């Protein structure tokens, strides 16, 4: 009772050593100069390939033995994609990299987790999906955000769409062992990408606030995230950078102690079966939610207004109830979220019918 | 210029894992077994005297090889204390304990993470009072709050004493690797230290958003520290207990990305000289540093009135000369302080005439 509830509470590994500051990215050789103990050992760069031909893939501070990879995301990572880069990496050198760095938005640093940790651990990736599967300490990694509001270098797990469902790799070693935030790096996003990858980081603060798995350490990060994310999205601050860099960081804090909720669970649904990116997918997602966070959409609605942001529509529509069946499949299993949103008896409440209901007003 | 700048951020270790929640003492004891790899290892458990015969001590996992020191903080953690723990433990064992626990306040826990350096570094702590000199990591050290608000589980110095003056072993090795924050441990501390000892935490916050060393980063952390203190001191809040913990913490990750002022400047003059502990000894700074926080000493004084606080007035009235210059050179000797205070140009306005100004109206 009073014992069981006192060893209930998470032991939260977070990541331990963070550089913030505009500029910061020209401190990433000597930050890999500490990893590097031999004449011939070599640092894999997995960067977003978005920056391949930009200013910023000459400022990759690669050595010649280094591997460089410019990574698609045009699809969001998937376990085939994790195992292909890993068997990439094994191809070029037997030896363990001294590092793994991931440069780009939540997909990217996702990569790197993935693929630090597949490196020291046999199988696919697919055989990690879920919670603590993961017995090998990762390869040593770093994050650096290019897009800011996922809250993925701040957290424990490495999303993958896998043979079955949206699942990460959830586990203490898959945390980055160093981040960079540099908020020159996010400046050219385009404006729709950097409003709905924004709405991730204040979807999942109203989705923690909401919700049962909530304790002050989680409240106090999503409180202050979201007041971050007003100030960046509706009061148009000129450090709106920095601030939005730090609102990512917080919500990923914050949901590490806590849970994400319904609109992350129809999410899933959308970006397994249709493909939808996570962003603009949850605020979908969220736009048919106003009976679960009435507050929450309210006040996107208004964000969506002054960012000129018109949602797509009738997406689901016309499509066969085959296709909607298998939206519902996913989003139902994912029990934590459920969880979360209703307490104990979520089952009950969570049925084929109301989430049917829903993805047909997407 | 762009280079120089981008290569001043600070790359900032914290507390890599933390358990937040009351009852979470429990854990201790898993916590403690993954770091024991033989039959004969150790911990050194220092433990605040406050608890010596309080249900507490009773709770303390100590196996029978351990050892258990209650230590005296009646006055604040010298390097010579340092030094006489450091010797208990060699004494006791000659092989180097496992972990180095920390059960109290600040001075506890900065105590605990000065044994746990000078374990592997040889010398006094006198010869480690700075920046950076640290050279060995530490043994394996744990932080756990029984008084809540200096910040000290969630940063990278520990403060002492020493021959010539109040200064910390500033370095990423006194990090803790572990902390658990448990608000149930902080039930029974007198209303006068509880109040002090979170003013430690409002004015840290106050400091930081005042000064010239402020980035994104500290000012998110400090702003919502500063709001749960409010919840906590204004508003009565019923978790109250856990608020003012998150606001210790958050406090302390401010101060590690920016710094403190010349409310810690003078304070640490009062400490070193008279010997007023660091929280009223704050209190009694900051009543009369209006000039510098007019809003923060107004806030400040309303909390005082309904916490029924009355300082203790003409403490240096009447004192000689001598004593007042002795607190004066302790006070200016600060430099990162004024700095943060007052910016480039800090020596040419913190004057002994100035700081014997102050002093003389406490
Ligand atoms: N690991 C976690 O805890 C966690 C949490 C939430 C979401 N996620 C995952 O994050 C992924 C989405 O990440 P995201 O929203 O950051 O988007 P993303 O990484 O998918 O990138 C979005 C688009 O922005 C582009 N882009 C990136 N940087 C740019 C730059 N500076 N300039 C111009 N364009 C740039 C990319 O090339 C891409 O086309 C999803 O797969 C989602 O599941 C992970
Ligand atoms: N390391 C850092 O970053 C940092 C930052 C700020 C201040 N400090 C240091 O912290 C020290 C002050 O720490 P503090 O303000 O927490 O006070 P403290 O640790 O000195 O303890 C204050 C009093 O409260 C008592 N106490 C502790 N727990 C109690 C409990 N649960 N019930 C009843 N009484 C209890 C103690 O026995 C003591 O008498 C100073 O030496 C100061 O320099 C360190
Ligand atoms: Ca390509
Ligand atoms: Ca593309
Ligand atoms: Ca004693
Ligand atoms: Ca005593
Ligand atoms: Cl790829
Ligand atoms: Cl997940
Ligand atoms: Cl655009
Ligand atoms: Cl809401
Ligand atoms: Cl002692
Ligand atoms: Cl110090
Ligand atoms: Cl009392
Ligand atoms: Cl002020
Ligand atoms: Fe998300
Ligand atoms: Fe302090």
New interface residues.
Partial sequence: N??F???????????????????????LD??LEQERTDANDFVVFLVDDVHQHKPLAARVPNKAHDLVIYVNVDDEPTTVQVDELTAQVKAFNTKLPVSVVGLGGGSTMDLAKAVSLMLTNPGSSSEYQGWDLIKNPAVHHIGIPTVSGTGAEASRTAVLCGPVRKLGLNSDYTVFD?II??SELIAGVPTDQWFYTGMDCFIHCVESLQGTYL???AK?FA??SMD?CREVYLDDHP?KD??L??ASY?GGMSIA?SQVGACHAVSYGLGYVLGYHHGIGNCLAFDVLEEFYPEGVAEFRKMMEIHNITLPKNICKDLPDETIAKMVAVTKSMGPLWDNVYGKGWEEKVTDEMLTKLFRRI
Same sequence: chains 1, 2.
């Fill in positions: 009073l014992y509830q006192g060893m209930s509470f998470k032991n939260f590994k977070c990541v331990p050593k963070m550089i913030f500051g505009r500029g910061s990215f020209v401190q000597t930050v160093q935030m540099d304790n002050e350490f106090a409180e202050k971050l450090e920095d601030k860099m730090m917080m102690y």
